Amino acid sequence: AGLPRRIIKETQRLLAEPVPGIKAEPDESNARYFHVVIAGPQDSPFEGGTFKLELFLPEEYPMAAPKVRFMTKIYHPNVDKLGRIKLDILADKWSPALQIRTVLLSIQALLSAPNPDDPLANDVAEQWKTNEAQAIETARAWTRLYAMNN
């Protein structure tokens, strides 16, 4: 009952070479379970926010994607109320050459470029389309409230 070699090396390297704005650390009692914090992108409504995520490496990793959820509430067309992320690299566009590090950088990318035309949170997206400036200021307020001092 030991981890694939991939998880061991990938984990050493992740910690060896941290990325600015991203913190990801395995749970001491569970090497498949990662505590994550990501900074909101700069020049986004999420800027200045610190967003908690969980990441889980399922049994078929890296042939299957990490399972990933927001734990910090966020206002975004492709994330729902329960913090689930609809994102093609976590499903059909996964590649085994992607890794924890680049999954997390892709989530940031997703915050910097939301896609309300193909949404997960229908109300959020409807706001985003029909009144983008307002949807943006809502994201900024939710960022202050939930994703600062947390």
């Binding site: 070699r5 991939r6 090396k9 990938e10 890296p62 042939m63 590649s95 085994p96 050459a97």
Partner: protein, 123 residues
């Protein structure tokens, strides 16, 4: 084991790229700088290293020096250890043969560049 070079000019990876040349492979998995192989094939249509008739050939992307499989993360020695091969796709991306096999069970796009898709390389 370590750093790749061209058996014809004998330049290592650094010297090859220094002046615009690429690292290439033949179908038979033999590796050269682009210009040495271009100029051999003007002269004869046989692989310099193994003398197979070569018609096609392509760039491989290994930058740095010390080769490994991006999927399992085993380096050169660990891969051969267990009778896996180093393999390149037509788009020049390298994996161990087990990981590319397994990956193609699920996707049949290159894990590194997503081009729809190979052969052993000998380094």
């Amino acid at each position: 084991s370590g750093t790749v070079s061209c058996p014809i000019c004998m330049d290592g990876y650094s010297e090859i790229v220094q002046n615009g040349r690429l690292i290439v492979s033949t179908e038979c998995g033999h590796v050269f700088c682009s210009q040495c192989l271009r100029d051999s094939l003007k002269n004869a249509n046989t692989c310099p290293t193994c003398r197979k008739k070569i018609n096609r050939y392509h760039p491989i992307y290994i930058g740095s020096g010390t080769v490994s499989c991006p999927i399992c993360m085993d380096g050169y020695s660990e891969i051969v250890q267990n009778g896996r091969l180093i393999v390149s796709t037509e788009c020049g991306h390298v994996f161990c043969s087990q990981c590319l096999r397994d990956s193609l069970k699920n996707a049949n796009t290159c894990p590194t560049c997503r081009k729809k898709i190979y052969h052993p390389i000998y380094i």
